[PDB]
Amino acid sequence: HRTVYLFDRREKESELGDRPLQVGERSDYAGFRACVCQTLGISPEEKFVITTTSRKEITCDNFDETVKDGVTLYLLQSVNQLLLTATKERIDFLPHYDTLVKSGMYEYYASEGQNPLPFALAALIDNSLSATSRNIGVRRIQIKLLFDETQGKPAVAVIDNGRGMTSKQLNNWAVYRLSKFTRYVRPVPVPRSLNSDISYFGVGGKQAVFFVGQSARMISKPADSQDVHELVLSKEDFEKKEKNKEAIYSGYIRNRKPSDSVHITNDDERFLHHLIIEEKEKDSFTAVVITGVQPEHIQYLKNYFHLWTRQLAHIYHYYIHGPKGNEINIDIEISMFEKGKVPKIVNLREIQDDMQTLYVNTAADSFEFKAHVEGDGVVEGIIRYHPFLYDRETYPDDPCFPAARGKRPIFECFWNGRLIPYTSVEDFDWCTPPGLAPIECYNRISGALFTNDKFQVSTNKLTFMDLELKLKDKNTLFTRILNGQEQRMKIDREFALWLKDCHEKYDKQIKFTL
Amino acid sequence: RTVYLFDRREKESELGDRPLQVGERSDYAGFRACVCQTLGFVITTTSRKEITCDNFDETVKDGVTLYLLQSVNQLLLTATKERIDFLPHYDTLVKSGMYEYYASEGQNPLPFALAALIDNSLSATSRNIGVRRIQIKLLFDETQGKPAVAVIDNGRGMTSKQLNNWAVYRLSKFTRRPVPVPRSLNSDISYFGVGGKQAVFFVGQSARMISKPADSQDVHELVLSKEDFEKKEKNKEAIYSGYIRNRKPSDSVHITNDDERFLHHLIIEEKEKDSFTAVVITGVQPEHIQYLKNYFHLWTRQLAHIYHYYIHGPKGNENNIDIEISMFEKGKVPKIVNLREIQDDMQTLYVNTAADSFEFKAHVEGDGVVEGIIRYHPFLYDRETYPDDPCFPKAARGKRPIFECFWNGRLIPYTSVEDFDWCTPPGLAPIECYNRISGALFTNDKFQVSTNKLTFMDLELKLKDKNTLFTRILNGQEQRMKIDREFALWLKDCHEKYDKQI
Ligand SMILES: Nc1ncnc2c1ncn2[C@@H]1O[C@H](COP(=O)(O)OP(=O)(O)OP(=O)(O)O)[C@@H](O)[C@H]1O
Ligand SMILES: Nc1ncnc2c1ncn2[C@@H]1O[C@H](COP(=O)(O)OP(=O)(O)OP(=O)(O)O)[C@@H](O)[C@H]1O
Ligand SMILES: [Mg+2]
Ligand SMILES: [Mg+2]
C-alpha cells in the first residue's frame, strides 16, 4: 500500500482539503480512475484529467512510474486549467546523511603556517576533558595511533576514563546539532575559565571523526552500567541503507559485557580485540575508534610526530599546567605504533618548547588586566616582558613566523581554557609605541587573552566570531589586576610606566666587543 | 506500541529479540503475564532499571528494548541490539549559519551571507537569454509590515521537486560540468548543498521560497522557519515534514497578517515574469538591520568587489548581469544602486590605477591550474598610486598581501597570498618597485574552499609546493621562461617607463 493525496480542483468551489488515497501493489490507472469517479460522484461521462503537481497527466502507460508513494495529484477539467484554489503538497526534507559524513571535510582549513589535523584531535580531547571534569583522581586521555599493519588497518583511537555514556547519551551523541542546551548546570566561574565546559554546538566530535576517517566506533560505559554500549556510524552503513531503501537515521546500539569482542569478525579490525580486552580494569570509560583514515593524515602523523604533539600541548597548555602556566591532574598521553619501530609515547606535559612554555619561562615580569565589554563579558589578559640580556633579545622564536617580537601579534586567544588557533590580536592602542618608555620595549611584550562562552567562537572552534571587535569598542573598560585586587586605571600611562620599570629592572646592556 | 524483548537469563537463551505489542491501556502485570505466556526473573530497561507498575508507563514506551534477566545486575552473557533513531536536530537548519560568518581583517561578514544567495541566482540565471536580473530588496519600511530581506532573480526557478531538494541540507549537485572559460567565470559556484540555508538562517529566522519555472503554470511556495520547527516539536509532529503551496501567479490571498503586508506588492509582480525565484527572509536580527541601514555604501561595495569579474567580465572594470540593491525606509527616499555603478571597490581601483600587467599560470601536480595577474602601480612625481584599502588603515602596498584570490569567478574574502619567491625583493630592479605590485589569482573547483566559502582550504600550500610550475602568459601563448628573471625584467621596464620624477 502506497498513499497518494488527491486534490479536486475542477471548480473553484471544489473541496479545499485533499483526499488521501491508499493504492495497492499492481493496480492500474483504470482502477485508480474508477475509484475516484465512484467516491466523488463523477459520471464516467466527465472528461476530467489527473495530473501531478507539475501538470503531467497520468496515463495508463506512466501510471506505475508517476503515482509513487507520497505524491500529490490534481483532479482538473483539463491539463492546464487555471488553479483557482491553492493546494498543499506534502514533502519530506530529511537532511542528507552527508550532514554527518561530510561534516568535517571542508572545515579544517590551513592558516598561519599550521597543519589543521591536530584541531580535529583537539575536538575529541575537548569532549574527554568535559567527560573527566568530575573524576576522582587522574583524568586520563589517550590518543592511540594504531598504524602497525601487523595489528590490522590504520586506526585512530581516543580513550578516556570519564563518566561515559548511557544508551540514551550515546543516542544523543549521534544526533547532529544536539547540544547541552537542547537535550545543564552552568559551571561556576574559575580563573582562565579552565572549567572543562568546552562543548557548545553538538557537532564537534562528528566533524572530527569524519574528517580523520570514514567510520567511528563509539564504545562507552558509565560507572553505574554493567553493560558496555557500542555504536558505529560510517559512510559504508549509510550507503548500504541508501541502496536498500532503509531508514537513513535508524540503527542499533550493541550492549555487551565488558571485554567481549566476539562481534569483531573483520580481521582488518584485529586491533579491536586488544582494545576491548583492556576494559576489565575500567569502571568507566569512553573510546572513539576511527577507521578509514585518509592516507594523507597517516603520513603527516607519522612524519611530524614532534610537531603535532607540540601543537596539542600548545592548545591545552593551561589545562595541562594550570592557570599560571608551565612555570618550570590531567594526563594527555599520545602513543603511536608502527611496524618495525618501538612504540612512540609522550605525555603532553613533557613537552617544553610549545609557545606558551617558552613565553612563560623567558618572561621576567607580567602585566595583568581585565577587559569589561558591553554585554557584561569579561576577558582576562596577561602581558609578559621578555628582556634584552647583554647581547641578545630573549623573545622566543615561533616556527610559523620565520627585533624581538617582529611583526608578530602580541596576543594568543583562549576560549574556556583552550587555544583558539586562528584568532590573534595584534595589539591594543595602549600597548603600541607612540615617549615615556623606549620604543624597542613595545617589541618585547607577549600576551594571552582568556574568555568564557560570553564571547562566541565559530563552530569548528578555529576562530572567535568578533573578539577583537568587541575589545576595541569605545565602551570597553580596562582594569588592572594587582595582588589579587582589580581596579580601574589610566591604562596608556600605567602600562607605559610598567614597561619603563621593566626596562630599568631587567634589560641588561653590557657586552664584550666582537 | 511495540517493545523489543531480549531473553537473557542463560547463555543459551534465544539470540534474537521478540517484538511484543503492548496495548495502550495495559498494566505491568498484564504485560508481565503476556511475557510469561509468550516464552515460558526481572525485566529491565537497557540501563538495568527494573520495570515496576510504579514506573511502567514512564518506561515501557513504543520502540524501547527490554531485558529479561535473573537479576537486575546479572552479567550480559550474550550481546543485545538496541534499536535507535538519530535524526539530525532541526538546528541543523536553524543554527546552520549562526556561528559560521566570523569577522576577519576588519570586514563585517554579513554581506558574505548575501553573496551565498547571489551565487545561487548566478547559477539559476546562467543560461538566461537576455538579462540576468538579480535583485536584493531590503524592506525595512515598517508601514509595510515587519523587516524583510528579499533576493529575487529571473532564473530557471524550481519545480516542486527541486524546491523539495533545496530544503534538504547537504543535498548537492553531486547527490541530486561546464567547459573551462577565462577566470572560471562559469556561474557554476555551488558545491556543498548548504550555502543558501546558512545564509537565510544567519540573516533571519524564517525563509519563504517562492519559485516558478517557465515550463510551469503554477507557482511553488515553501516556508522553513524556526517557529514552525518549534511547533512541530511541541506537537510531536515529524520535524522534516511540511508542504509546498502551489498557486496561480499573483495570488496573495494566503497572506493575512499585517506584518507581512509587503508580500502583496511582491507577489503581484509575478504576473510579469515567466520564470523567477524569490527568497524572502523574515525574523531579521536587529543588528543586521542596523548595519545594513547605516553602512549602505560599505556593504554594497563589498558585494561589487566580490562579484567584480562577474559584473565587468574577465578584464575587470576598465555584460547582461544586473545585480540591483534597493533599501526602503519609512519617510525616506529608496536607496538604489546597481553594483556595476560602484567605482571604488578594490578591484576597480587596482584595474584603473594600473599602468601595466603581468599574467601567468601556476600548474599544480594533480591537474590544477591557477590563473594569475600582477599589476604595477607607479610613483607619479610626488606620490604612490597604489590604492588604499580601508581594512588596512615600503610606502605603497606596505605590509598588505599582493594577491586576492578568486574561486569560480567570485572573490574568496579571507584568503590572501602575500607573495611568491619569484616576485619578492631579493637587485636587477629597484627594491621599492616590488612594493608597487598588486595581483589576483583565479581557480576553478580543482582547488578546495571551505563550506562557508570564506577561505581556500590549502591554496597557498599547493602554490608554493616545490613541484608547482610557474609559466608566463604573453599575448595569448604560454612562454616557457624562468618566471623569476622574466618578472624582474618586466619590473625594470615598468620602472623605466611608468615611474615619473617630474
Ligand atoms: N568522550 C566522551 N565521553 C562522554 N560523552 C561524550 C564524549 N564525547 C562525546 N560525548 C557526548 O556526545 C555529545 C556530542 O559531542 P560533540 O562533540 O559532537 O558535540 P558537543 O561536544 O556537545 O558540542 P561541540 O560541537 O561544541 O563539540 C556531547 O555533548 C557529549 O554528551
Ligand atoms: N535562486 C535559486 N534559483 C533556482 N534554484 C535554486 C536557487 N537557490 C537555490 N536553488 C537550488 O537549491 C539548491 C540548494 O542551494 P544551496 O545554496 O543550499 O546549496 P548549493 O548552492 O547547491 O551548494 P552550496 O552549499 O555550494 O551553495 C541549489 O543547488 C539549487 O539547485
Ligand atoms: Mg565536542
Ligand atoms: Mg548555494
Numbering used by the authors:
A (entry chain A): 25 to 207, 218 to 362, 373 to 446, 464 to 495, 499 to 578
B (entry chain B): 26 to 65, 72 to 207, 220 to 361, 372 to 446, 463 to 495, 499 to 574
From the manuscript:
Structural maintenance of chromosomes hinge-domain containing protein 1 (SMCHD1), an emerging player in the field of epigenetics, is a unique member of the GHKL superfamily. Originally identified in a mutagenesis screen for novel epigenetic repressors of repeat sequences, SMCHD1 is now known to not only silence repeats but also a subset of autosomal genes, particularly those that are imprinted, mono-allelically expressed, or clustered, and to maintain X-chromosome inactivation. SMCHD1 is a 2005aa protein with an N-terminal functional GHKL-ATPase module (1–578aa), an extended non-conserved middle region of unknown function, and a C-terminal SMC-hinge domain (1616–1963aa) that mediates constitutive dimerization. Herein, we have revealed the crystal structure of the SMCHD1 N-terminal module which contains all of the conserved elements of the Bergerat ATP-binding fold, a transducer domain, and a novel ubiquitin-like (UBL) fold.
